[PDB]
Design a protein around this ligand. Structure first.
Ligand SMILES: NCc1ccc(C(F)(F)F)cc1
Ligand SMILES: NCc1ccc(C(F)(F)F)cc1
Length: 330
């Protein structure tokens, strides 16, 4: 079987993308953030502290005839940005784009951090990293993809994120009309639970390509591109007036500048990120300083190919027994 679902940016800067997911019987539709950097399916619910809910659609397990409490199970997650949530665990039927999984662990939030409360458009997260990262205790739970794998035509899903526009997540098949050229596949390390791969180098604008190994993760759940300080410094040096700002916490640039493109290597292929994708607009309303979409990973400890990079490509997540990542131009 297969599934296909449209994913939509939550705001005009593409800060995150939401995809409708049907949970329970009869279906409750929630808009979830599909996150290849984590492995928990958690949702705002009827159990969430009322002061921590501000416009989100909630899952109500008591109204689902297929929901079962997973006795004694709990979960607690903290994200790399300092975000967190925690609560208890149901199992229920979950469908994405026509693809149905019965007995999926649905983690019900009792508590969420403030950054989730303030993001009224995101009802929860759907984790798509490897199940070794799932936080359910005492019994670890499988991801939606892991549960669906057996029944998929092909054990793959693909991410086709739009620039200021809707895109598509497909499960179980590769749409050969959605890209140009060939797909280049590259090896994945699962040893930390992430879709981790090694880029073969980079170029700034029309500069020479620099061959150099950049290890990092493919993460639909992270907005920006986080790369080593040496790389990020070479990019922003080409932008007149750009500088790293400690008060803002990253590189900013004059909003009147035009940004160079950024190229990253996948084996012998090249993915080009247009300079417009790297503009994240004014740091505050009315400011003439704009925030850059390429930032240093020095404080984070790992390099992250977030949405800025992934939306420039058609991306195959191949969950075969030897996993790989495919990139194509589009
Ligand atoms: N999108 C999930 C996520 C969040 C943070 C991290 C970090 F910072 F730990 F790498 C990885 C993955
Ligand atoms: N990388 C996972 C993640 C996704 C979204 C958020 C936000 F923006 F909703 F707070 C935080 C962390």
């Amino acid at each position: 079987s297969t599934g296909s679902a449209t994913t939509t940016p939550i705001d005009s800067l593409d800060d995150a993308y939401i995809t409708p997911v049907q949970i329970g019987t009869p279906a409750q539709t929630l808009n979830l953030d599909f996150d290849t950097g984590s492995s928990d399916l958690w949702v705002f619910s009827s159990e969430t502290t009322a002061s921590e809910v501000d416009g989100q659609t909630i899952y109500t397990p008591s109204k689902s005839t297929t929901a079962k409490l997973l006795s004694g199970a709990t979960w607690s997650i903290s994200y790399g940005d300092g975000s967190s949530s925690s609560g208890d665990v149901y199992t229920d039927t979950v469908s994405v784009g026509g693809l149905t999984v019965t007995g999926q662990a649905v983690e019900s939030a009792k508590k969420v951090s403030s950054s989730f409360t303030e993001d009224s458009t995101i009802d929860g997260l759907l984790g798509l990293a490897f199940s070794t990262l799932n936080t359910v205790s005492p019994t670890q739970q499988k991801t939606f993809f892991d549960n669906a794998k057996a029944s998929l035509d092909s054990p793959v899903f693909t991410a086709d994120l739009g620039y200021h526009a809707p895109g598509t997540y497909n499960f179980g098949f590769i749409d050969t009309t959605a890209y140009t050229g060939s797909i280049t596949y590259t090896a994945v390390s699962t040893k930390q639970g992430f879709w981790e791969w090694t880029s073969t180098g980079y170029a700034v604008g029309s500069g020479t390509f620099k061959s150099t190994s950049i290890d990092g993760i493919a993460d639909t759940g992270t907005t920006l591109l986080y790369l080593p300080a040496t790389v990020v410094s070479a990019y922003w040096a080409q932008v007149s007036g750009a500088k790293s700002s400690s008060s803002v916490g990253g590189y900013v640039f004059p909003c009147s500048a035009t940004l160079p493109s950024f190229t990253f290597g996948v084996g012998s292929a090249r993915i080009v990120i247009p300079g417009d994708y790297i503009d994240f607009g004014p740091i505050s309303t009315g400011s003439s300083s704009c925030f850059g979409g390429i930032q240093s990973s020095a404080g984070i400890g790992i390099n992250i190919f977030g949405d800025v990079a992934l939306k420039a490509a058609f991306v195959v997540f191949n969950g075969a027994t030897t996993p790989t990542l495919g990139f194509a131009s589009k």
